[model samples]
Target: ESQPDPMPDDLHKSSEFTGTMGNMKYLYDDHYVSATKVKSVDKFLAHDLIYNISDKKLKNYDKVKTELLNEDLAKKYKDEVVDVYGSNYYVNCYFGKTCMYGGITKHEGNHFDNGNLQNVLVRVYENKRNTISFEVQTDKKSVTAQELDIKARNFLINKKNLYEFNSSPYETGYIKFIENNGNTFWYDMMPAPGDKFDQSKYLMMYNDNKTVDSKSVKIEVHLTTKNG
Candidate 1:
């Protein structure tokens, strides 16, 4: 068998340089370097909880809608409306609940119809930037604000790695609001460098990191050059 080309020993040389191969110019280093061109990016973090609406024991749907509407959100998204529904319309209300004969039978003399009149209120949020937010309020506090923050953080971390960004050197912010009988959790994250040019906009570059960074330094060079 023929022998393969010997690997270069000086590949460990750590330095930064800019050069052009054909029509493309590039700069790189031995340490962390990102050449990805970012035009637009989406970085979002959110936590949601599902619960049975009846637990709050609210008087009626009117109170449910009023209580769930955040004063600031209501004014910001004035056109946004509240939606209230009952178990008869929302069949999923019986999810994970004990029911018989089309409803819950826990009560005496009459079927509780646990899912019958149960109400669900939905609040919608939007901004001039076209970012939409949603909140579902029920009588139950399924998860605490802290718990949701942890969940949101984990999710954002995963997204950071998926997008091939340096997860550690990034900045993050958290915000929470009390809505009706529950809480809304939110998190915002961005790359360490505020410059959009420093972030990767190509999925291939991210996938390459996923393949090589997870194990060892695996460099693949393409002789031809062109701007993607």
Candidate 2:
């Protein structure tokens, strides 16, 4: 079997255009040319991860969430908040042992006893955006809320595709923070260039780079509330 040759560091420093597809030589733009007939590892992860959250929940998600987003398993996954280049880095938790964010549509506080906050969510949107913010579902504590902000941010920049972005040129990631009701939400806000039927948002990592696992998504779905 053959694998892509190693790329030199700082390759991203210079930019180049290609007259080909399937070349892992873009600035974090893995959405490459188009979907191939062959089942792509990238497409599979993106498609399934999104579906896991949008259509059905992850396989064994409920049980996994209890483990992934658990507080006691804090160390097992990402549990603490730390300084940001300019914000809290919860994004770290979103990508690693806690790959917990997904296609979360609007914010519905833990108004219901059931809380998805404890589940890994798609804080950083890819097609629509790249992130969501957190404050423990209760912004009553700005101190804690701000701390949550850092945690989520780190999750994205430090965890999520940060590894992918730094490791290869196929998957690129960027984001910004927006605040509302004193609670901050980090979103891509910007749309992909020529955003038509784009698959650029789907990122692949570790052979099966799923942001929202089928099992974990089960918890995300439970977080949904039908508030009239």
For 1-228, candidate 1 gives per-residue lDDT tens digits of 222321333111111112111110011111111111111111111111122323223222211111111234223222322122211111222222211011111112221235332122212221112222222222212222222222233333343221122222211222233334232222222222222332122111221111001011111111111121
- Could you estimate the TM-score for every candidate? 0.19, 0.21
User: How far off is residue 123 in model 2, in Å?
Assistant: 2.8
Overall lDDT per candidate, in order of appearance: 0.20, 0.23
lDDT of 1: 0.20
| Deviating ranges (above 4 Å) for candidate 2 | 1-122, 129-140, 144-146, 157-159, 164-172, 181-228
How would you encode candidate 2's per-residue C-alpha lDDT over 1-228 as one tens digit per residue? 222222333122111222222122121222101111111111112222211111123222211111112222223222222111111111222311112222111122212244322432335443344234332222211122222333343343334433232232222233322233232222221123331212223221111211222112211000111121
Which residue runs does candidate 1 get wrong by more than 4 Å? 1-142, 160-172, 181-228
Among the numbered candidates, top TM-score falls to: 2
* Top lDDT hit: 2
- Estimate the Cα RMSD of every predicted model relative to the unseen true structure: 24.5, 18.1
